[PDB]
Amino acid sequence: VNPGVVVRISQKGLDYASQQGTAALQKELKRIKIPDYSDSFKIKHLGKGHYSFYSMDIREFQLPSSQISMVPNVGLKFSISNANIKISGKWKAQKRFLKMSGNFDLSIEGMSISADLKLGSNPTSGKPTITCSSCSSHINSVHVHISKSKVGWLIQLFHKKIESALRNKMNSQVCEKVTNSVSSELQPYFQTLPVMTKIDSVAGINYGLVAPPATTAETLDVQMKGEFYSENHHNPPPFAPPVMEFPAAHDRMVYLGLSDYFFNTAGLVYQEAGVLKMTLRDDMIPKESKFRLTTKFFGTFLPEVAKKFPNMKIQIHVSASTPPHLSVQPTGLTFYPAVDVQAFAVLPNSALASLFLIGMHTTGSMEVSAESNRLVGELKLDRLLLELKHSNIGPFPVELLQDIMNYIVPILVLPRVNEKLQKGFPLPTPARVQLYNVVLQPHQNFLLFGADVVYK
Ligand SMILES: CCCCCCCCCCCCCCCCCC(=O)OC[C@H](COP(=O)([O-])OCC[N+](C)(C)C)OC(=O)CCCCCCCCCCCCCCCCC
C-alpha cells in the first residue's frame, strides 16, 4: 500500500514506450514468411489451367502510428491503426501449353492490430510480469498490381480464390509475432528493472515491487520497497513509509516519488555499519591552521590538559551514535546531523587517554540532483551547536571549543561526506534507459522527480 519509492508512468511515457516497442515489432513483422498460393481455373487466356502466386517477400511493413491505452484496473491495450504492407513476388499461369509468368506487387491496406497486456508482479522475487491476453488483426483492403496489362483475369482469380485465405493467414501470423514478442522480449526487458541493487561494500537498495503495477485513467504506478539494506543485517527499519499522493501530470514521461523513509533507511544502514566515523590526528590538520592537535597547543586555552598530559599528541574521534534523520518539506530536504566528538591524549605506551566528550549538532540542507541514472547530493551546514557531555580535565565552558570545531568540520569532516554524496546512488532504471528534462518539486514527506526518458 505505501511503498518507499514509487515510479509513476504518464500517458506521455507510455506514448514513448509505444513508439519504441512498435519499432522493435516492425522488424519482426517484416520477417513473416508468407506461404505460396496455387490453384486451378476454367476461365481463359484460354480456358484450362493452373496458376500460382509465390516467393513473396515483405518489402515494407508501415506502422504509421500506434498507441498504448490505459484501461483502468485492467491493464494496457496496444494498438496499431492504419498499417500497410507492401509485398513483392512472382506469379505464373498455364493454359494448355501456354506459359505466362512475371512479377507482382501486393498492397495490404488499412490493417488494424490490437493486443491486451496484463501487468503483474511476482511477490517473492519482486520482479514485474507482462502477459498478452488477446490479440486481433484485421485488414481493410488488398490490391494486386502486375506490369503486364493482359492479366486482369488472373488478378480477378486472385480476389475470388486466394485473397480471403491470404488475409486470414496474414492476420494469424501477425498476432503470432505480437504474442511471441511479449513473452520472449517484452517481459524479459521489463525484468531488467533492478531488484537488490548493490551500491558498495556496505549497502544496497531494495527496489523490488511490493504490489502489481496498477493502471488508472491517467497513471501506471509501480510501487517499490525503496529501502536501503545491509547484506549482514536483517531487521526492518523501526519507522514506516509515508503516504505519497500527487496529481496526475502529463508534461513529463515518468514521476519518481522518493520518500523520506527511503533516505532515512540509508542513514540507518551506514550508521549501523560503523562507517560514519573519522579519526583526526595532528598530521591531518592543514599547515594553514593555527589549531594544532597537541596538549601543548590545547593548553593555551583549556584547564588541566598541558599539565595533566605534558608534550603529548592529541587525537579527535568523530562519530555518529544514532542514525542521522532527514525530513522533506516543500522547502526541500533537510538533514539533522548529530555527532559525538571525543578528544584523547596519546600516552607513552600509545594508549588513548580520554580528555573530554562533547555532542555537536546542526541542521543542513541537502540539495539532490540527477546524473547518469543515479541520484547525487550536496550537504551544506548551518551553525554548529556544541554541548559538553563529560570531562576528565575539570569543568570548562564548551564555547572554548567552538573555533577548532568551526574549522575541523567544513575543512576535514564535511568533505568526506560530500565525496560520498556526490558519488551517489543508483536509480531503478531498466536496460538502455537514461533520464532527462528533470524537474524536482519537494512535497511534504517526499521528493518528486519528473523526467523524460530516452531509450536506445
Ligand atoms: C528514476 C529512475 C526510474 C526510471 C524508470 C523508467 C520508467 C519505465 C520506462 C517506461 C517508459 C519508457 C520507454 C522504454 C520502454 C519501451 C520498450 C523497450 O524498451 O523495448 C521493447 C522490447 C524490444 O526489445 P529489443 O528488440 O529492442 O531488444 C530485445 C533484447 N535484446 C536487446 C537483447 C536484443 O520488447 C518487445 O517485445 C517489443 C514489442 C512491442 C510490444 C508492444 C509495446 C508494449 C509497450 C510497453 C508496455 C509498458 C509496460 C511497462 C510495465 C512497467 C513495469 C515496471
UniProtKB/Swiss-Prot annotation:
Region of interest (N-terminal barrel), residue spans: 10-193
Region named C-terminal barrel: 260-430
Chain segments carrying region Central sheet, part 1: 1-11
Highest rank taxon of the organism: Eukaryota
Region of interest (Cleavage sites for elastase), residue spans: 209-214
Disulfide bonds: 135-175
Glycan attachment residues as annotated in the record: 349
Gene Ontology terms for molecular function: lipopolysaccharide binding
Tagged with keyword Glycoprotein: yes
Matching Pfam families: LBP_BPI_CETP, LBP_BPI_CETP_C
Entries under SMART domains matching the protein: BPI1, BPI2
Subcellular location: Secreted; Cytoplasmic granule membrane
Function per UniProt: The cytotoxic action of BPI is limited to many species of Gram-negative bacteria; this specificity may be explained by a strong affinity of the very basic N-terminal half for the negatively charged lipopolysaccharides that are unique to the Gram-negative bacterial outer envelope. Has antibacterial activity against the Gram-negative bacterium P.aeruginosa, this activity is inhibited by LPS from P.aeruginosa.
Protein name: Bactericidal permeability-increasing protein
Name of the coding gene: BPI
